[PDB]
Amino acid sequence: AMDPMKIADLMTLLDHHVPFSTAESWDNVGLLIGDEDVEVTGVLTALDCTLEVVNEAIEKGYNTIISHHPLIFKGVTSLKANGYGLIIRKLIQHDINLIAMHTNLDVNPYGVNMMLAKVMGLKNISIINNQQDVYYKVQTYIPKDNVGPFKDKLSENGLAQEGNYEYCFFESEDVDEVKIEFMIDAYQKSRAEQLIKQYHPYETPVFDFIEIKQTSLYGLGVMAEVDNQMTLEDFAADIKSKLNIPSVRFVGESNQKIKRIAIIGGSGIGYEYQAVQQGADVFVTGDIKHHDALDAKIHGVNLIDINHYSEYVMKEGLKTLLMNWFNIEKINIDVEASTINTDPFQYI
Amino acid sequence: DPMKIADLMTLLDHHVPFSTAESWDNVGLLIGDEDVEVTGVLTALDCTLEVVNEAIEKGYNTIISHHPLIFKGVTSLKANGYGLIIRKLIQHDINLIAMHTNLDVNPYGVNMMLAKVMGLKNISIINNQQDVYYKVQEFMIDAYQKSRAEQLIKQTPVFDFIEIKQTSLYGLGVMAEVDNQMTLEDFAADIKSKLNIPSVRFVGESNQKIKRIAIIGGSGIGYEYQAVQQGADVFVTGDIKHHDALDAKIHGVNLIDINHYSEYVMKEGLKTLLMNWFNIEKINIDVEASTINTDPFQYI
Amino acid sequence: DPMKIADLMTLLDHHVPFSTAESWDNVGLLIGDEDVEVTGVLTALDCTLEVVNEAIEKGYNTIISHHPLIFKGVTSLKANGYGLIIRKLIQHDINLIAMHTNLDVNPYGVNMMLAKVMGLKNISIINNQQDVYYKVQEFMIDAYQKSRAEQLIKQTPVFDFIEIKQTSLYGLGVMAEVDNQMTLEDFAADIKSKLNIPSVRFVGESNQKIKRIAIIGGSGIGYEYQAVQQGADVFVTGDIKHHDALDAKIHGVNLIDINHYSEYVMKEGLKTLLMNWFNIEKINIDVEASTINTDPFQYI
Amino acid sequence: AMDPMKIADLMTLLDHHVPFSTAESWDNVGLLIGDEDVEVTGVLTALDCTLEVVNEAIEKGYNTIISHHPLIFKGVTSLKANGYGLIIRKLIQHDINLIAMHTNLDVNPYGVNMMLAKVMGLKNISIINNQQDVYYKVQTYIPKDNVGPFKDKLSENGLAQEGNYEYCFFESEDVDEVKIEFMIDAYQKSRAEQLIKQYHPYETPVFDFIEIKQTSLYGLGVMAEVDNQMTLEDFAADIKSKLNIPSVRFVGESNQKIKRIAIIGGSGIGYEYQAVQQGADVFVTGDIKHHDALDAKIHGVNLIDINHYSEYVMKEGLKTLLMNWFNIEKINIDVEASTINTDPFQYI
Amino acid sequence: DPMKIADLMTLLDHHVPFSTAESWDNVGLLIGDEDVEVTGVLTALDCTLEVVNEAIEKGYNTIISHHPLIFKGVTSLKANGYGLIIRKLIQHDINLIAMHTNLDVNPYGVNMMLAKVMGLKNISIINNQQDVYYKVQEFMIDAYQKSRAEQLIKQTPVFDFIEIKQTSLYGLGVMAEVDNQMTLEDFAADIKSKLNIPSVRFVGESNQKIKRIAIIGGSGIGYEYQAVQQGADVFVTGDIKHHDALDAKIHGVNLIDINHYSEYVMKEGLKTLLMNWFNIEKINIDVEASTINTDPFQYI
Amino acid sequence: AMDPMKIADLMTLLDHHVPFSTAESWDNVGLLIGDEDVEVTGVLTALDCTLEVVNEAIEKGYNTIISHHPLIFKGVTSLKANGYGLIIRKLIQHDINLIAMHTNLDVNPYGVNMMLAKVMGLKNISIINNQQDVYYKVQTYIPKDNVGPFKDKLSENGLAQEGNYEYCFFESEDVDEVKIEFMIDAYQKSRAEQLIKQYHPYETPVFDFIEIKQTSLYGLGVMAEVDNQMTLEDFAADIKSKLNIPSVRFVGESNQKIKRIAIIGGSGIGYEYQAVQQGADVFVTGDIKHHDALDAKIHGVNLIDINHYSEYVMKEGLKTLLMNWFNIEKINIDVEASTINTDPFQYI
Ligand SMILES: [Zn+2]
Ligand SMILES: [Zn+2]
Ligand SMILES: [Zn+2]
Ligand SMILES: [Zn+2]
Ligand SMILES: [Zn+2]
Ligand SMILES: [Zn+2]
Ligand SMILES: [Zn+2]
Ligand SMILES: [Zn+2]
Ligand SMILES: [Zn+2]
Ligand SMILES: [Zn+2]
Ligand SMILES: [Zn+2]
Ligand SMILES: [Zn+2]
């Protein structure tokens, strides 16, 4: 008897590759509308889950929509047949599940900004603005001989990855001891306390947790470079064509030479000065407003507004990711990128 | 011409104006479609999953609850917790309307209803709101009338809108009285019995004499000192906590905790009001009070 | 008797009262010396270094900008960034005056100017401020008059100041209309051409029909729902972002982003007003609109 | 010539066993009304120091009242012959001292929640919601031979507990050194700096303080278990009887099987979800309100409201503690638990 | 029928209404028993332990201080610091009343008292409060009268309460004048001598000419710009700090720091007022000004 | 062709000796008005940069003013010919540069409070209220033999001061390793990550950054002592004379014996209780107000108000410092302390 993938199985897989915990604390991510117990019949990727997207999923026989933008962001106070209420109600009425992979996908090594840089044909793409993850270096003190492996083996048996580090030294030079050390993630602190107490000895078994911060693989934005050095206006025209953008605008001398590019898709104004500090010749983002562009201009910070809507690259990008992850796990569920242009703006 | 949700909403607003609700509150049509024809109305304190099941059972597509099922914004709608109730409503095409603080402050609302169930006399609204009305220079106008009256009166004329403040009919709480003075203990026992309450608790000497009573159903602590100022011998409310009771006791302010759940009286009270309003308008729609006891507490 | 900065400031305040500006805003003489004789006036949207160079070139010692060059307090004044422009003004004895939100809400200001440049009809101020005026008991008085009228009327008399609130002439935005209904797409194209805009974008079906138009130049998102309430078929503003456009789209609210930079129309609009005001007062001072395109954006 | 116990001596003893520093930072604990210099004539324990409690102390010839709840919580703005003013004035006029042992007693291993669990007849009682205490691992580098004990001995002489830990290694492999390490509490950092500077050598004597956090023995609440698995309603009836409560109310299916119990006496709503995470079958507390019970019910979190007033168990509990502490120290001062029922509520 | 604390409180409220005190302030009976018969009244700026000892010595059981001994809530009452003074009061059955900001804004209060001690002329309250009074439709009513007048006038009648705002008699500060113009230096020296101040300091050229003087006793910085607006040549207050003095100096605003402690003049000033009020009411109770110099500063 | 000192060269030198980063985060320090590219013609020191000070610099041919107090503190919203606008405009019009050395000079070992204590003739002067600086102890694990110096040499080549510390031990007792450790300042964390990755080996090169906090040399205030124990009033009269103060006021018994003195020039009320904890017999500051003096008196905290204006000692103090720093660097630029008494107060 089969184990067809349920929403709960999909959630675990999504979380493995694009951890929901990497989303900002203000964000609203994960299963927003649906039922964990339901069997997935197909997956439609979307930037914004508009009414037409829901209609498209229904028409295709798919019961799961993964969007970038959370359809429910601040709590909804009503669910009427109007506005966003009409979309939410239609999902529920048709038993469609909606998952949001929002800022977790913005900060992922394979997420929105890797996807943007790739579509722009750029090279040497690296995450920037790295998160910091908290670890602990756990240090225990134990006598030599057989009580060392006795510790090692039991500790490694009950989890806590089998990489240890051992040094001789004297407690008091009365009691000669071995100081053992290993790493734990911040969540394991509790378990590590338990397991050390259970399989150690004395009246006062000595153990320490030393906070270690490590640079994360996750961060908001990428730095990349063009193949060949280019003028600002030529780089702007190039990416307008590659991303099929109706209108692009840039801030800076049109003949400015550009090699290193920082990209935060969406609305990344607030990071442009830091991007310049980090080595960018231009900061690429959307939703750039007059006074921030004016400020950038006077300071010599070069900008390109590719429009917030250029995050739409994640529909095909995430479709490709998910098909790969499904291949690995030998899952045959169909994934399609929504073909609807959901940009609220029409350009003239 | 069959009554739709939109028509119900108009009628309810007429009799219990949604604008009298507190600004923090979430009232009106919370879940539904205003174009849908009302098949029947079930009244509820809390819209639990059992209450939704009851509406479905009775063939009713409209629930009016006191407490808003969605109060702070919902962050997700999953098949769990409150998500389950909201999803069940939507999937069964049930409309949910909340008449919350607008009902608490209505002259015929929660506190009138409590005082009637207690058999009280001389019941009047306390803690009255203030209505803003302009005298135009002379005749009277309401809040919104101030825009159009310029838009009308400017067809070179010299005119004036004078703000006048009027004590509202609407307010949180009622003051009322027993026929004859009774002890605090006897009054607490009397209302326990009348409201079918499993357990009541009071603050004050059992032999204190009670004539004038202030009532705020739900959770009305914060108002007990004012009530005493307004003439109450006792303040009746729910959800009274230790430190607030201890303060009242030391200050000589008498209280009775009838439990927040005592707002359940609005189910029958609202059923009766709505049957009457329907009668006036010649609407032939069935209204029932939910029979489900939705108190999360069981008393021993 | 030659006009000084102080005299200019008086005249500008007469026609576009600096007190109609928002309380957060920074308006008036921002950089200068009120005793200095005005040699000429250059109007500007943003006072860039190029605009300062232009004033110097033209022999003008007075610039009137819409946008305040100093908005939040300056923490330093170095030869870099905005420091460069402020220092250049001072070192060349150029006076900078900001007519910012007071011009946005003026009956002849930014939004009248936008609606005229679009060739619109029936243009009226929307979002009107409220003026406080007292009726004394009877005759009328203004804001400041309430002090002196006691100081005058107390020379034992029994008197009254009655607060009356009056719809102001001043407000953020105008409502206006085209001669004949046109599609949303055609109207957007029409205004693109009339304002010489490199790129315009709109929200709403291209074949939506437009008759009544609400305009707030600059960055007016926050007001689009109210505008629709006030009768607009479309809200015209700049600096529209994705999520605000997506919200409007789902709610059926039509928008056009003409870009914040479209406030540049106030350069010629202000030049014309100031030439007229000068004429009335028989002041022979040259006024020019800056010809510099100061948009930080270049469009492709 | 005697050393009769003064309030200041009592305060030191109280603080030793139920440290005032473990109280919450918003709390108001310790000597609230009185004179440190005054000789203690007897001690009356109380939940709330009401007028009748003060009258009881006067009648008994006791000049010290220890209450759980602070009679002065937010600053008093007046002291009139009315309300709480009348109680405060009566204490002062009769030279009665009032000490509050509030949230420090809530979080103590022998405090309010241990006492509740014991009165309920429960077993395997353990503190939960543990505080974290900050320590430092101080590391200094010193040459071997005689300068090691020279360091050890002087450091241990000037306090800083004589548990050291020593390891060989090379500074620069030019200057061979011994790295010595030991623990200090967070307050000793200053002294440790001084003492290391004074008895070390070089131009730049190398020493480090490494922050270590340890799970405290103090925490808000206990987890315990019933002897024999029981239904929720039976457990509720049992504890109503054991604590002599006029009325108890519970949230949950009456036949729910209960083994593990979390208890926060007083008003502990806000912790029930965490208690369930920590393994509780039911969260026992007081002052439970409708909407929080409604939420608990829908989420399957089981609750029992034993009333805030059930904290009254600390009068006899603290009396027993204090008599034990006085025995140890050979102090003959009488301690009595106030017999007044001070519950503002009367149940019908 | 001997005067109790409650009767004193009524009389003081009549002449120096406790409701004119700032909302942050702590005034009235701070420590005491309103049923206790007043044996005598000692006036005080600060109620120090020495002032309590003086009351006890004189056989007086009532102290009226300007500064509230309890301002923010007391968190403990131990035999140390301020605890010592509060405990001594209570243990000796001394009643402490605070007439703080209500005395600062009174027409006969701190600032009248300062201006009199300086020998000034044409003294008037500045910074006046606003009194709310309703004209009922016509006759006048006060703040509280608005409730009962409905409760009275509703025995179907159509009526109106019109809010009228009236300049109060009460305000922080006085404006006053010398008989003849004098230099800033000479005026500072004159008031130093008249108030027996060990050290005075002034801001402004020593030869500036002074005629009109604004005074706020205590710590009145924040009001100096307004005072100049109101016509003052100099603002007189205490507790002036470097940066506030430097700002005033650069703006041409003249100041004199007479020290916060100069509010001590209210001891004799209040003694005189209270003897007079007692006379009117035929109360034979002794009132003395405390003779203790309570300044924490000693000057060298 | 010369390298005459420009403002940018002066800024670097100032920052070296009195780091701008030690200023409070609310403060406004450094070059407030001027041009980094301009050649310095002479330096005038000032407490407050008043109009007369600017006039004095012009008259002397000096184009640089260093003040203690920042002429621009909260952003200026206008620059009119009035008030502070007139001073700012006059600086700009005459090409005068103004640097503020504000709270950085308050907390410097040679700054305002050292200068105050020295002018008072005091001894044993020590900074108090020390800042804490964040460092990292970087720990890497590397095999013995030749890969150790290979690491050492390259790491030391690319900066990161050549003080290392080495200990033997076993990774897994499979792979025997050397644990190397060294210090970095908090800014080097990024570089250290790079350089370790570049010149280390494995699939997972193990390195840790351990946060170390050290007591700074910078702090607000000094503690010092009088030569000979003195009465409070005599100490007050002495310092009034030494600093030429028109009027001094003190709080405390006039015959109180004084040996240890805490000094925060300016407006240091808020620190007096801590100063007493730290061992002061009197707290010396300016701008003392009635209610704070009243509080101090009742608590037995002794105060002397020497007036905020007594910070004027830094004009000659900083002149002396700067002349010394210029000597070292062989710079011939004139430095003069402004002679203008800029006290807004005149005493009578
Ligand atoms: Zn994104
Ligand atoms: Zn986005
Ligand atoms: Zn209610
Ligand atoms: Zn309720
Ligand atoms: Zn504008
Ligand atoms: Zn603008
Ligand atoms: Zn407790
Ligand atoms: Zn409690
Ligand atoms: Zn005062
Ligand atoms: Zn005062
Ligand atoms: Zn300073
Ligand atoms: Zn200073």
Author numbering:
A (entry chain B), D (entry chain B), F (entry chain B): -3 to 168, 191 to 366
B (entry chain A), C (entry chain A), E (entry chain A): -1 to 135, 199 to 216, 222 to 366
Paper text:
SA1388 was predicted to contain a central PII-like domain and two flanking regions, which together belong to the NIF3-like protein family. Overall, the protein is organized into three distinct structural domains with interconnecting topological connectivities. The two NIF3 domains at the N- and C-terminus of the protein (henceforth denoted as NIF3-N and NIF3-C, respectively) have the same overall fold as canonical NIF3-like proteins, with a central 5 stranded mixed β-sheet and a pair of helices on either side. The middle region of the polypeptide (residues 126–236) bulges out between the two NIF3 domains and is structured as a classical PII-like fold with a (β/α/β)2 architecture, confirming our earlier prediction.
The final model of SA1388 (gi:54040095 Swissprot: P67273;) refined to 2.0Å resolution consists of two subunits in the asymmetric unit. One subunit is traceable across the entire length of polypeptide from the N- to the C-terminus (residues 1 to 366) with the exception of a loop region containing 25 residues (168–193) in the central PII domain. The two SA1388 monomers in the asymmetric unit tightly associate to form a dimer along the sides of the two NIF3 domains opposite to where the PII-domain is located. In SA1388, the two entries to the central hollow space are capped by the two PII domain trimers. We observe clear electron density for two tightly bound metal ions at the junction of the two NIF3 domains in each SA1388 monomer close to the protein surface that face inside the hexameric toroid. The identity of the metal was determined to be zinc, first by an extended X-ray fluorescence scan at synchrotron and was further confirmed by Inductively Coupled Plasma (ICP) atomic emission spectrometry. Additionally, we observe a clear electron density for a ligand of unknown identity in close proximity to the two bound zinc atoms that would provide two additional metal ligands, one to each of the two metal ions to complete the octahedral metal center configuration.
